[PDB]
Design a protein around this ligand. Structure first.
Ligand SMILES: *[C@@H]1O[C@H](CO)[C@@H](O[C@@H]2O[C@H](CO)[C@@H](O[C@@H]3O[C@H](CO)[C@@H](O)[C@H](O[C@H]4O[C@H](CO)[C@@H](O)[C@H](O)[C@@H]4O)[C@@H]3O)[C@H](O)[C@H]2NC(C)=O)[C@H](O)[C@H]1NC(C)=O
Ligand SMILES: *[C@@H]1O[C@H](CO)[C@@H](O[C@@H]2O[C@H](CO)[C@@H](O)[C@H](O)[C@H]2NC(C)=O)[C@H](O)[C@H]1NC(C)=O
Ligand SMILES: *[C@@H]1O[C@H](CO)[C@@H](O[C@@H]2O[C@H](CO)[C@@H](O)[C@H](O)[C@H]2NC(C)=O)[C@H](O)[C@H]1NC(C)=O
Ligand SMILES: *[C@@H]1O[C@H](CO)[C@@H](O[C@@H]2O[C@H](CO)[C@@H](O)[C@H](O)[C@H]2NC(C)=O)[C@H](O)[C@H]1NC(C)=O
Ligand SMILES: *[C@@H]1O[C@H](CO)[C@@H](O[C@@H]2O[C@H](CO)[C@@H](O)[C@H](O)[C@H]2NC(C)=O)[C@H](O)[C@H]1NC(C)=O
Ligand SMILES: *[C@@H]1O[C@H](CO)[C@@H](O[C@@H]2O[C@H](CO)[C@@H](O)[C@H](O)[C@H]2NC(C)=O)[C@H](O)[C@H]1NC(C)=O
Ligand SMILES: *[C@@H]1O[C@H](CO)[C@@H](O)[C@H](O)[C@H]1NC(C)=O
Ligand SMILES: *[C@@H]1O[C@H](CO)[C@@H](O)[C@H](O)[C@H]1NC(C)=O
Ligand SMILES: *[C@@H]1O[C@H](CO)[C@@H](O)[C@H](O)[C@H]1NC(C)=O
Ligand SMILES: *[C@@H]1O[C@H](CO)[C@@H](O)[C@H](O)[C@H]1NC(C)=O
Ligand SMILES: *[C@@H]1O[C@H](CO)[C@@H](O)[C@H](O)[C@H]1NC(C)=O
Ligand SMILES: *[C@@H]1O[C@H](CO)[C@@H](O)[C@H](O)[C@H]1NC(C)=O
Ligand SMILES: *[C@@H]1O[C@H](CO)[C@@H](O)[C@H](O)[C@H]1NC(C)=O
Ligand SMILES: *[C@@H]1O[C@H](CO)[C@@H](O)[C@H](O)[C@H]1NC(C)=O
Ligand SMILES: *[C@@H]1O[C@H](CO)[C@@H](O)[C@H](O)[C@H]1NC(C)=O
Ligand SMILES: *[C@@H]1O[C@H](CO)[C@@H](O)[C@H](O)[C@H]1NC(C)=O
Ligand SMILES: *[C@@H]1O[C@H](CO)[C@@H](O)[C@H](O)[C@H]1NC(C)=O
Ligand SMILES: *[C@@H]1O[C@H](CO)[C@@H](O)[C@H](O)[C@H]1NC(C)=O
Lengths: 119, 122, 436, 112, 122, 122
């Protein structure tokens, strides 16, 4: 149900915006849209989350303002804008949907195939 | 942090005891209210200090006494109490023996001081 | 064996006196507060959970009491208007007045006292219909409170702006706060931190809608003592503001009348330009989305296919049937039925609310102390953030909710729900292997 | 601000029998733990949530338990079911009070 | 009993000294009066504690000093004072030397502390 | 005289320390003012006593600690400080290290008490 795009090569110091489209469900309901990245070597870490019911978002400490996460229920998509990119940011990026209800609360149950960003 | 040790075990928490100690003293609406609050805060401080005086623990954060543990109060092991429990949990475990222990501590101190005078008079 | 430890990090639930602090002629005397800490600290308590209950929180009671007492102290030096309890000879204002506003303003005249005991003066002023009653069933009228209470003029130099205050614990106490973004007011709170002082809280007074408070960070929250009990209120906190724009589009004049040595009364003079009805505008699309969010969450307590209907308030006094507020110094009583008129089924524009205005106010629902609000010259415009609602259940597949008023306490427990006061108990004992 | 430590980084077995994976939180997370199975070529699949509840996309072979800050995962019988990297995920950040802040430990490679 | 030892002899009474010590801290009519009374009770408590501090007897119910009895204050025998007299009677017998003894105790303590510093500096 | 030692050198002045210590405790206009003043005087007294407690100097006018002088605070000689300077001058010379020294004293006392318990437990 999640389809990603916007991957590719970034010249160091540049920017890249990733997108993740919902299909089969609406982002207008209470879900978390989060991005994680998998480094070469398989280290896995969280990047950011946005609550679609409000636009509220949280970022990983290592971001330090370089990433912006946002959503639009009218497109039924979510995006991640990355800036000041370097070689260290090479990773497969993935979007996933977390539930906001009692069972599976904060649990990522829906994952899309990710997309590669190199710098 | 003033209550930062609240989640620590007893054997870990009792190293930062001065953190809380330092924060115990720190006619219109919001006028008379402050005067009344200040007086009561002072009274609370003094009652605790008087008890440490009576038990012979004045001036200390940690003091040993000569009163035995009676077991029935809590039959837990020292390695269980100090390493796997917090002070909030402990306070609940023996809350109903508070008055027993305090009475025992007071009598012990009176006996000790009388005996010291007998030796200084020798 | 017994070791006594002092400075033990434990606490118990407690009730004490809190004092205010302020970050610095105001009706709440906020200048009388202790200056705040420019950079207050907050300590996270790792591995500590605590049990909270917003319905039994005595911090609400102190806030309620401080507000009323401050309000009363602020009127102590103000001029009394007892010489106005006279027979007023009075007629209607008909000059360039909009229909459906016609009959609201009256032109009254009377014999008022003056500087000297031996003299009387003939004066006239305008009054709103809601402040007078007819006695001679021109016609004779009297002010509405002359048979029940004393009327005191609010001092014109005193502000009613809801400047926030912070509550702070005294030495020996601490305030615990919940951080859980979904906390519903009672029970265990998995993430707790400590503060010495609360966030600033604005002493805003309203009825059906809450006009300038905090928003929920994530989801829309519904809180109630019971939900099930139809005698209880439901407090609904929005996670987005709804913008409301209110106006009193009448350019008024103001004049003073000397009534005795050192004393004067402020009277509405006349109207410059046409006479129009006061009103408030609520964005329509925002209101519609906001209710949709509330309904999705209300259904969690009533059933998956339960129909939710909103209806307007029941009959009674304006003070309990309308949305009231103090803004710009005027007291508005607005008709909210346009906001509660829909049925929600399982599976640019605006809403205009007409408003009424009163000058004689029984502020805390008490009887015997009436305040007179002097008129304000010029034109008044206000913009505010609706942050929440007070709803009740009108009580088999359809539930109906109505807005309603409530105690003043319910407008404050909505901000203080996250805070608890505890006292610190530094002595304790434990077995050790040492002996003196 | 929750840091999860996962160990061993490499776990192996003969074909047949069980292995375990442990995970330690830096702070109690009050059982807000999820376990994921990531095979090469895909995103992680959710097997277990809220410490011990299965997603039904996984059989009883994958069992686990824990509380507070310490949890374990047991794979009861390894039939070369996977060559997955297993990950320990915190779904609740107690320093914020939300479910919007996630943390992952490094993973464990299971070889059989 | 708080004053229960009043009829006891001095050598009998001074065994229950904590009984009295524990009871020293314990805008309308009957409003402002309590606030004023509480403050004064605190001041009295502190003045007595300060004197014990100054004389080197802090934390004790009974303390020996190094000040000699000058005889002229009371030329009674120890067996007479401690066994055949009460504290009320004794207080009357030497009431007029109170200020003499206190002055002597204060100077002695200052000399002792200075000498201890000289030894710790050695 | 209460401030009589103000013109004395440090090594001369610190012999009359009890003179100042003894003078620290000593709804209408001139009504409510006295009640407020009394409360604040008590609070000041207690804060100073609490610090002496925390640093392990309770009950003393002069106490040695085990905290080293760090030199950079003041690189004067002992014969210069104690004999050719007054306390007012000294207070100015090291006024900006007050908080450093107090923090060091507090930690030292906590370490000492923990070590004493380990020995009494042996
Ligand atoms: C919800 O919050 C909003 C935002 O804080 C608040 O709106 C504010 O209301 C105050 C009072 O109505 C406005 O302040 C006035 O602005 C006009 C602009 O020209 C000034 O002229 C006014 O000054 C006169 O009146 C004062 C009254 O005490 C006198 O003291 C002064 O000497 C002048 O006579 C005054 O500054 C303020 O501008 C708005 N804010 C905005 C952004 O418009 C709103 O009222 C709150 N809602 C409720 C119900 O409380
Ligand atoms: C909250 O609990 C956790 C564990 O339940 C504590 O973690 C310990 O932190 C110390 C820090 O050096 C480690 O040495 C321990 O090994 C950790 N525990 C475990 C089980 O590994 C944490 O410190 C606690 N928080 C507080 C305030 O004590
Ligand atoms: C003061 O006068 C008012 C006005 O006449 C009285 O209020 C009325 O009371 C009757 C009683 O049935 C009601 O029907 C009217 O509707 C009331 N009028 C209004 C404007 O509410 C009031 O009761 C009088 N107060 C006292 C103490 O007698
Ligand atoms: C609040 O406003 C509504 C409509 O703006 C008023 O409703 C009207 O009330 C009369 C009373 O019989 C009805 O006949 C009309 O049909 C109502 N109109 C609508 C659209 O429902 C309501 O009375 C106002 N409330 C007050 C107290 O004035
Ligand atoms: C009141 O005085 C009488 C005697 O004058 C005290 O009696 C003594 O009680 C003790 C109790 O064991 C006996 O050992 C003594 O022998 C008694 N005295 C005599 C002369 O026999 C009595 O205790 C006094 N009351 C108080 C409170 O001390
Ligand atoms: C004020 O300063 C003078 C000297 O500057 C001090 O005089 C000293 O007094 C003592 C008293 O025995 C003598 O032994 C010293 O020799 C004197 N000093 C000199 C340089 O001779 C005087 O005491 C000071 N006042 C105070 C209060 O200390
Ligand atoms: C004044 O208001 C009353 C209300 O019924 C109305 O009957 C009367 O005609 C009005 N008078 C004028 C002059 O409009
Ligand atoms: C009230 O009556 C007086 C009488 O002359 C008139 O001048 C004044 O304009 C009237 N006010 C209104 C608002 O009609
Ligand atoms: C003032 O008193 C006189 C006395 O006759 C009366 O006629 C007049 O109507 C009164 N005026 C008003 C405005 O009440
Ligand atoms: C608030 O949440 C707790 C969580 O267990 C629940 O028990 C309680 O009933 C809820 N409050 C209401 C009014 O339902
Ligand atoms: C109100 O809450 C109490 C809590 O025990 C419950 O027993 C009672 O039934 C509730 N009221 C209704 C009408 O359910
Ligand atoms: C409310 O909307 C009407 C629509 O015509 C507008 O005329 C009026 O000025 C608006 N009121 C406010 C307070 O903006
Ligand atoms: C309130 O006034 C502002 C002024 O820019 C306007 O943008 C807003 O839409 C108005 N709100 C309503 C409800 O009309
Ligand atoms: C919200 O807008 C939709 C648009 O079709 C409408 O059907 C619905 O009834 C509206 N709800 C309210 C409360 O106005
Ligand atoms: C609510 O709407 C109905 C519609 O007929 C109206 O009769 C009733 O008086 C309204 N309530 C209030 C308080 O206006
Ligand atoms: C409520 O909805 C009905 C639907 O036709 C409408 O006629 C009525 O005027 C609405 N009420 C209000 C107060 O707008
Ligand atoms: C009211 O009328 C006076 C007449 O000169 C004018 O100066 C003032 O600005 C007007 N007020 C408003 C709000 O238009
Ligand atoms: C309404 O909420 C917005 C949210 O950012 C805030 O910026 C604005 O100041 C708020 N208005 C009031 C009156 O609080």
């Amino acid at each position: 149900q999640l389809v990603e795009s916007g991957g590719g090569l970034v010249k160091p110091g540049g920017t890249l915006t990733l997108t993740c489209k919902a299909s089969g469900f609406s982002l207008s309901d209470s879900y978390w849209m989060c991005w994680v990245r998998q480094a070469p070597g398989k280290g896995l870490e969280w990047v950011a989350c946005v609550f679609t019911g409000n636009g509220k978002a949280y970022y990983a400490r290592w971001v330090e303002g370089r990433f912006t996460i946002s959503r639009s229920t009218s497109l039924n998509t979510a995006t991640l804008q990355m800036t000041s990119l370097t070689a260290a940011d090479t990773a497969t990026y993935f979007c996933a949907r977390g539930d906001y209800d009692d069972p599976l609360d904060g649990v990522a149950t829906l994952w899309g195939p990710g997309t590669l960003v190199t710098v | 942090g003033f209550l930062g040790a609240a989640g620590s075990t007893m054997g870990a928490a009792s190293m930062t005891l001065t953190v809380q100690a330092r924060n115990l003293l720190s006619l219109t609406v919001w006028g008379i209210k402050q005067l009344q609050a200040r007086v009561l805060a002072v009274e609370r401080y003094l009652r605790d200090q008087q008890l440490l005086g009576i038990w012979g623990c004045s001036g200390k954060l940690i003091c040993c006494t000569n009163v035995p543990w009676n077991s029935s109060w809590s039959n837990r092991n020292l390695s269980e109490i100090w390493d796997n429990m917090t002070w909030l949990q402990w306070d609940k475990e023996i809350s109903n023996y508070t008055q027993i222990i305090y009475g025992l501590l007071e009598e012990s101190q009176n006996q000790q001081e009388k005996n010291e005078q007998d030796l200084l008079a020798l | 064996w017994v070791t006594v430890y002092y400075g033990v990090p434990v606490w118990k639930d407690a009730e004490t006196t809190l004092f205010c602090a302020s970050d610095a002629h105001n009706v709440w005397a906020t200048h009388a507060c202790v200056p705040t800490d420019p950079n207050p600290q907050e300590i996270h308590l790792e591995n500590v959970t605590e049990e909270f209950n917003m319905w039994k929180n005595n911090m609400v009671e102190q806030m309620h009491t401080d507000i009323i007492s401050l309000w009363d102290q602020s009127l102590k030096p103000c001029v009394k208007l007892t010489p106005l309890c006279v027979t007023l000879q009075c007629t209607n204002v008909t000059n360039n007045i909009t229909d459906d506003m016609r009959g609201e303003l009256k032109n009254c005249s009377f014999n008022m006292t003056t500087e000297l005991r031996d003299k009387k003066q003939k004066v006239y002023s305008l009054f709103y219909r809601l402040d007078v009653v007819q006695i001679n069933e021109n016609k004779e009228y009297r002010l509405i409170n002359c048979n029940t209470s004393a009327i005191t003029q609010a001092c014109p130099k005193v502000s009613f702006e809801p400047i926030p205050i912070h509550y702070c614990a005294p030495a020996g106490f601490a305030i615990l706060k919940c951080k859980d973004k979904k906390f519903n007011g009672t029970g265990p709170c998995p993430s707790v931190s400590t503060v010495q002082c609360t966030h600033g809280i604005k002493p805003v007074v309203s009825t059906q809608l809450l006009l300038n408070g905090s928003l929920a960070e994530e989801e829309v929250m519904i809180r109630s003592e019971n939900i099930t009990n139809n005698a209880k209120n439901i407090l609904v906190q929005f996670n987005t503001p709804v913008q409301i724009n209110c106006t009193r589009p009448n350019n008024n004049t103001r004049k003073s009348i000397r009534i005795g040595p050192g004393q004067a009364f402020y009277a509405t003079g006349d109207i410059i330009g046409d006479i129009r009805q006061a009103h408030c505008n609520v964005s329509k699309a925002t209101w519609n989305e906001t209710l949709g969010k509330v309904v999705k969450q209300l259904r969690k307590h009533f059933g998956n296919n339960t129909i939710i209907r909103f209806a307007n308030s029941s009959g009674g006094d304006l003070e309990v049937t309308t949305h009231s507020f103090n803004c710009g110094g005027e007291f508005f009583y607005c008709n909210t039925s346009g906001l509660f008129n829909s049925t929600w089924i399982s599976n640019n524009d605006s809403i205009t609310l007409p408003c009424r205005i009163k000058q004689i106010i029984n502020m805390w629902q008490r009887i015997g102390q009436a305040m007179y609000a002097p008129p304000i010259q010029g034109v008044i415009r206000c913009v505010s953030n609706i942050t929440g609602l007070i709803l009740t259940r009108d009580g088999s597949t359809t539930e109906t909710f109505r807005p309603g008023g409530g105690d003043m306490r319910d407008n404050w427990r909505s901000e203080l729900y996250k805070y608890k006061v505890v006292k610190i108990e530094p002595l304790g004992v434990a077995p050790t292997r040492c002996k003196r | 601000d929750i840091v999860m430590t996962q160990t061993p980084s490499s776990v192996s077995a003969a074909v047949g029998g069980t292995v375990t994976i442990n995970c330690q939180a830096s702070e109690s997370i009050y059982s807000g733990l999820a376990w994921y199975q990531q095979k090469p070529g895909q995103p992680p699949k959710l097997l277990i949530y809220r410490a011990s509840t299965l997603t039904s996309g996984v059989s009883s072979r994958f069992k686990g338990s824990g509380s507070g800050a310490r949890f374990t995962l047991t794979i009861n019988d390894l039939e070369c079911a996977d060559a997955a990297t297993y990950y320990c995920q915190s779904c609740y950040d107690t320093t914020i009070g939300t479910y919007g802040s996630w943390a992952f430990g490094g993973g464990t490679e299971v070889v059989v």
